[PDB]
Each structure stands twice: as structure tokens, then as C-alpha cells.
Design a binder for this molecule. Structure first.
Ligand SMILES: Nc1ncnc2c1ncn2[C@@H]1O[C@H](COP(=O)(O)OP(=O)(O)NP(=O)(O)O)[C@@H](O)[C@H]1O
Ligand SMILES: Nc1ncnc2c1ncn2[C@@H]1O[C@H](COP(=O)(O)OP(=O)(O)NP(=O)(O)O)[C@@H](O)[C@H]1O
Ligand SMILES: [Cl-]
Ligand SMILES: [Cl-]
Ligand SMILES: [Mg+2]
Ligand SMILES: [Mg+2]
Ligand code: NA
Ligand code: NA
Ligand code: NA
Ligand code: NA
Lengths: 384, 384
């Protein structure tokens, strides 16, 4: 019988537990599990982007919980006037709630859905929240997303910040159920390059291992790091940072003598594993600018792919209201970011090639060589 | 000032309009726009999967609206006892609401989030809902997701079914703002192959064009269709349909003399453009089964990629509670579907190769040839 009684409304966080795939991703291969950590970290990085947090500490505890401490402003603790409970609890228990739906609290932020930390809460058998703010320490415990008591003041402090510790629920997560140091370290190292002046620490209480990431030199240094085990073919990394029409575009790149393409794309510091409009705009401008240079210099047929070979690049954009296809933010779907990246790249890469003739000639040589190897491969296939 | 007043809770459908990327995808390239249609169509297909709908009519109207009529059970119209309005209105105005959170109303369904048609509503400047059910016609109008009046009875009928017509909001959608016949037709043709016995019609009132899709022969015929403009190299399409441990696995495939790989993956009839665990399980079993055969027959080095070349395949699974990474369901993230597809493929493909020696020998020849062309290409690159 299919009728009004067959229609069910899921309340509170029940939808997150019922359909975890659309909130956390894969609950069996480990990617979702680590994403729980990254949601919490991304909120601390957003305080850093806002100018209020200079230290983030991520700890893997010996009981397979993870904590993230920041020295930012603290999650607001006062009673929410419409909801009638602490704003912190509203944040933990309600989907599409937060401070990132306008630009008053965070000019730019990776956060935008008002979902992240409520997902972590919903899919955790236990979550501990400690907030330092307005001279007071506040604490609250949750179990499977359910607060055990209202947020309470437990003492005094001269500090500000948020600490979230969570124990992931094995009723949701399967197979890969323990945290992997290196997965966290890769992300935190990257965030250090992307956030100069922010101290990021990682501690594993299981074995005493620790790292302190505080790289200087930003995404240019990031490119050096990435080309470390490779062989750069020209000495001058191309780099710029601009802010035009409300969009920040920061790019660094350098070619190596290998044959892969590795473009790392970021939007408000969140990586897009599956690319997007920023990657689309980067590719377009590279192709156009290189072809124009080769045409003008009489070196001209190479396609976009030949310029891709041996390339390492980092594309980092800062956008007031970006659009992602999902909560995990694997893909940027904002058409105006394509235009901003393409426009800035076309202007500044053309200037780089004029100002750095030695590099320009090496890169042209590489593009020609990649095109030659591609045609030889095609001919060889046809002849088998 | 960052405090409890800075924390905003988005109510009703406001989150969909504020953050359309996570609900509909790209709002500028046309993919999101057409996805609005597919959400509505997917609900009609779910009535077809349940055994209650035999005809679906999709019309592109001359005012750039689209309607979808089905002859299924009709969206329930009675007052929802907890919500206090018609179940239909609950469905249109509330996220995470519907009849697909258990298996009572739909044993298997592409729908699972309770979100789809509320998204279409939220991002439409106007939506018209007509429901035929319990001897009555019911009608309701919405504007930007807001019902203009409670669902009302407007007459009598011997029929059952749902008609949704929507006019997409240009405050959300940009650039590609008109519907493209061929985009809809591709999806509907595919659904006809996947749903034998369901009449699917497409009408464009702009120019009078129409199609009636009612293919027989299912996914095997689908493979014939896909290999039409290509050159199949062996005459017997591999095909099976099984249901084991609550999971349906249906596969068809055939090699052609080209060099691409085209695997079409579906879960409860929804395509995964970005693949998933079903695609992962298909690839694994193909590689294992082919290698075992070549080993046993003394034809054995070919990798997974060589078997991929020239392949057209359709993998269609039926799963009680699948897991997708997003509302657009581009990727299946359910590890137990990997195992089901891998297991069934290994058994049945091995039997196919034993029972069809002429085909088996042709395919082995193709794999060897692809491996030969791949090594020649590699050598040619190295030597440039
Ligand atoms: N470490 C923190 N310090 C201060 N405020 C925080 C912190 N973590 C969360 N918040 C606040 O809590 C809100 C909700 O966080 P969260 O559920 O992650 O959603 P969001 O960051 O707004 N968006 P998203 O992560 O994309 O879903 C944020 O918008 C902030 O207002
Ligand atoms: N054409 C239809 N005929 C009958 N019932 C329908 C139809 N369309 C929608 N429904 C009902 O309305 C509910 C909500 O539909 P919808 O918002 O699309 O979410 P869903 O199909 O349940 N899941 P999802 O599409 O993945 O978000 C469904 O679960 C059905 O109970
Ligand atoms: Cl009813
Ligand atoms: Cl406050
Ligand atoms: Mg967040
Ligand atoms: Mg649906
Ligand atoms: Na929340
Ligand atoms: Na914002
Ligand atoms: Na809904
Ligand atoms: Na279901």
C-alpha cells in the first residue's frame, strides 16, 4: 500500500546516517574516514584565512580518535535566539547552519554548505567539543550526534580556540577503520604551503611520531617540493598572485624531464581531486599562450597535451561563493573562475616567456619533443 | 563581530537556492539544467521498476518548460499525519523526505536521498503538479518552491499517474538556458533499453519532433546499438543477468576493431558517468578471467588496459541501498557491489569463453594485438 503513511521525513542528523555516501563519500576504503578529519581541519583553516588562527594541532590518539585544536575565535557559544540552544549545538545538530552564508564572519572560506562538522558529529560514536571564548572554557559531549548535556562553562582562560575530538562510528565505517598518519600528513603539508605563517602540527600518540609544518615560500616552494624527486628542466619557476574582480588567482609551475602532468588545483584551500573550471581555465590559457609565443618566435602541430607532459603546477583560487558538485568538494563547478584563471594566466605567462628567454627556449624544446614522441607512438601503433 | 547572531540556519528549500552546486551540479554549462528533467524522469522510472508504470511521456514545451507524465501510482495526496499538509507538498518542500528510505513502496529504486523533486521545485520559477489517484485529479502550483494553494481536487478520473511541469529559474541557471532535444533523447533511449516493456515518448512542441522508444532485447540490444557505427570483431555478444545475495547484476559486452573503451555503468538505472565500484569489479573480473583463459589455453604480458581496447560493455546493477558520492549520482561508492559484479563476471565470462571458442580465439588475438601495439608505442617514444 503506497500512501501518505509511506512518506517519511528524516529529521536532525538521521539523513546523514541513513545516506552517508552523499555527505562523507566512501565509508569502506578509508577516504571517507579521513575526510572526517579534513572537515574539522578545513574549519580551522577558515579561521586562519580570516586572520584569526596561527596554530593548528592535529592529534591521532591511541584509542583511534582524532583531535583538532585551533587558536581561532572559537565556535560561538551564546544561545541562538531562534533555535533556543547554544549556537555551537545548532551547528553540531542541524544541517545547513553556520557563519559562511555571507562574508561578514569569513571574507573567504573553504566552508560553504553549513554541513561539515554536523556530518562528523552524526557519524561519530562520540564527539568532544571544547571551546575557548569570552574568558571561558565550554565543553559538550555528543554520542551518535546526540548532546548529552547543554554546552556548559567549565572554567576560565585567556585563550580563544576550538578543539574537536571524535571517535568514528563503526556502524558507518568499515574495512579501513584506523587513521593513517601519512594521509593526514600529505594534506597538512599542502595546507602549510598554502597558508604561510600558520603553524600546523601533527602528532601520533600511538607511536610518538610528530611533524611540524611551517613552510615558507608558499606555492612556489610547493612546486620545488613536488619537483624534488624529479628533474626540473629550467631554473625559473613561473609564479604570480593577483586579485581581480573579487577573485584571487595564484599560480606556480615548472616543467621537469618526465612525462606526467600533475596539476594541483585548490579553491579556498580545498583540493579538487576531480578538477573543475579552474583546471579548465588553466589548460586553456597555457595552450593559447604557448601557441602564441611559438607562432611569434617562429617555432611553429603541438596540442594542449604536449604542453602538459612534464608539467607540475599548482593553481590556487580564492572565491567569495564558489560552487562544488558535492560535500566532498572534489570538483569546482563555477564558470566565472574559468574566466578569471584563463585571463590572468594569459597575461602573466606571456610576460614570463618574454622576461625569461632561456626558460622559454627550453620549454619550447620540450613541447616540440613531446609532439615528436606522440607522433612516433601513433605511427608505431598504426604499423603493428 | 563573530557570535551567536552570525550563525544562520537555512530553512525549507533556501539551502538549495543558496548552494545549487551540491544539489543540481553545474548551473552554467547545461548539465544541471537537463538534470532537472532527469530527476523527474528517474522518479517515473522508479514506478516502472516497482511494476506500476508502463508509459512515460516527456514533453519540451514551446515556452521552454518541460513536463513528465507517467502512469504510475501517483504521488500520495492524503494529509501527512506529522507534517499536517498533503504528502505531495511535504515531498515538494522538505529535503530528505520520501518513500524510498525502506523497501516497502519500491523494492529497488534509483531514488534514495529524498531530495530530487524538491530540488527541481526550489530551482524552478514555476512548477505545476498534477496527480491522478483514488479516482481524483489533484493539482498544485508552486513559484520558486512556494505553494500557491494547498493541493486541491479538480475532478475525477479512472487513471493513476503523476505529471510534473517546471519552468527553470534564470536566477539560478545561466548560459545554457534552453533544453536540447538530443540530450534528453540519449538518456531516454538508454532508459528504454534498460526498461523493456516501458513505452517512453519524447515530444518537442517547438518544432514537432517526436520519438517513441520501446526497444526490445534489453542491454544486449543496447550493445548492438552502441557497436552500430563500429565494427564488431566477433559475432556473439556476452550477456547474463543474475540475482545473488540480494544484488542484481546484468552485463553485456562485445569487442570491436577500434581502440576505445566504452563501459556504461548503471545502478538502479542511473548512469555513473564517473564510474565506481561496479566498474572496478567489472575490470577486475575481466582481467582475471581473460588471463586465466590465456594461461590455460597456452596463449600466455597483456594487462587490464589491452583487454579494454575495442571494448563496449554495459554493466547494470540492482541494489537495495546503494551509496553515491553526490545527489547527481555520478559515482557509485558501494564496496559490496564490487564483489558481486566481480564474482558473477568471473563465473559467467569463463563459461562464455569455453562455450564460444571462435569468439574466444578472436578476443585473445585482439588482446595480443593491443599489447603488441602498446609495446611498439612505448619503444617509439623512448627512441625519439
Ligand atoms: N574551528 C572553528 N572555529 C570557529 N568557528 C567554527 C569552527 N568550526 C566551525 N565553525 C563554525 O561552524 C559553522 C558550521 O561549520 P560546518 O558544519 O563545517 O559548515 P561550514 O564550515 O559553514 N560549511 P561546510 O564545511 O562546507 O559544510 C561554520 O560556518 C562556522 O561558523
Ligand atoms: N512520479 C512519481 N510517482 C510516484 N511517487 C513519486 C513520484 N515522484 C516522486 N514520488 C515520491 O516522492 C518521493 C520523493 O521523491 P524525490 O524528492 O525525488 O526523492 P527520492 O526519489 O525519494 N530520492 P532522490 O531522487 O535520490 O533524491 C519519492 O520517494 C516517492 O515516494
Ligand atoms: Cl494518500
Ligand atoms: Cl556568542
Ligand atoms: Mg566546514
Ligand atoms: Mg527521486
Ligand atoms: Na551543521
Ligand atoms: Na561565505
Ligand atoms: Na523533498
Ligand atoms: Na529504498
Amino acid at each position: 500500500s503506497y500512501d501518505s503513511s509511506s512518506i517519511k521525513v528524516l529529521k536532525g542528523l538521521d539523513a546523514v546516517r541513513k545516506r552517508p555516501g552523499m555527505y562523507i563519500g566512501d565509508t569502506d576504503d578509508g577516504t571517507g574516514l579521513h575526510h572526517m578529519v579534513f572537515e574539522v581541519v578545513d574549519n580551522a583553516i577558515d579561521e586562519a584565512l580570516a586572520g584569526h588562527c596561527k596554530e593548528i594541532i592535529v592529534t591521532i590518539h591511541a584509542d583511534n580518535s582524532v583531535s583538532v585544536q585551533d587558536d581561532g575565535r572559537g565556535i560561538p557559544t551564546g544561545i541562538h535566539p531562534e533555535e533556543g540552544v547554544s549556537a555551537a549545538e545548532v551547528i553540531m545538530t542541524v544541517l545547513h547552519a553556520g557563519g559562511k552564508f555571507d562574508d561578514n564572519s569569513y571574507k573567504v572560506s573553504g566552508g560553504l554548505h553549513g554541513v561539515g562538522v554536523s556530518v562528523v558529529n552524526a557519524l561519530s560514536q562520540k564527539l568532544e567539543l571544547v571551546i575557548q571564548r569570552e574568558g571561558k572554557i565550554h565543553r559538550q559531549i555528543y554520542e551518535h550526534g546526540v548532546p548529552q548535556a547543554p554546552l556548559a562553562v567549565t572554567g576560565e582562560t585567556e585563550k580563544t580556540g576550538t578543539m574537536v575530538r571524535f571517535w568514528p562510528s563503526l556502524e558507518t565505517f568499515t574495512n579501513v577503520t584506523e587513521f593513517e598518519y601519512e594521509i593526514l600528513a600529505k594534506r597538512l603539508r599542502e595546507l602549510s604551503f598554502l597558508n604561510s605563517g600558520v603553524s600546523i602540527r601533527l602528532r601520533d600518540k600511538r607511536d610518538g611520531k610528530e611533524d611540524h609544518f611551517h613552510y615558507e615560500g608558499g606555492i612556489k616552494a610547493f612546486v620545488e617540493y613536488l619537483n624534488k624527486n624529479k628533474t626540473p628542466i629550467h631554473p625559473n619557476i613561473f609564479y604570480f598572485s593577483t586579485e581581480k574582480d573579487g577573485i584571487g588567482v595564484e599560480v606556480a609551475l615548472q616543467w621537469n624531464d618526465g612525462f606526467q602532468e600533475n596539476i594541483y588545483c585548490f579553491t579556498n584551500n580545498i583540493p579538487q581531486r576531480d578538477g573543475g573550471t579552474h583546471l579548465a581555465g588553466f589548460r586553456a590559457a597555457m595552450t593559447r599562450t604557448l601557441n602564441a609565443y611559438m607562432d611569434k618566435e617562429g617555432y611553429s602541430s603541438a596540442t594542449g597535451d604536449d604542453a602538459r607532459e612534464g608539467l607540475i603546477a599548482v593553481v590556487s583560487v580564492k572565491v567569495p561563493d564558489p560552487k562544488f558538485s558535492s560535500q566532498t568538494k572534489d570538483k569546482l563547478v563555477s564558470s566565472e573562475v574559468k574566466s578569471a584563471v584563463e585571463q590572468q594566466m594569459n597575461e602573466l605567462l606571456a610576460e614570463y616567456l618574454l622576461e625569461n628567454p632561456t626558460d622559454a627556449k627550453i620549454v619550447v624544446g620540450k613541447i616540440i619533443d613531446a609532439a615528436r614522441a606522440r607522433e612516433a607512438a601513433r605511427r608505431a601503433r598504426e604499423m603493428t
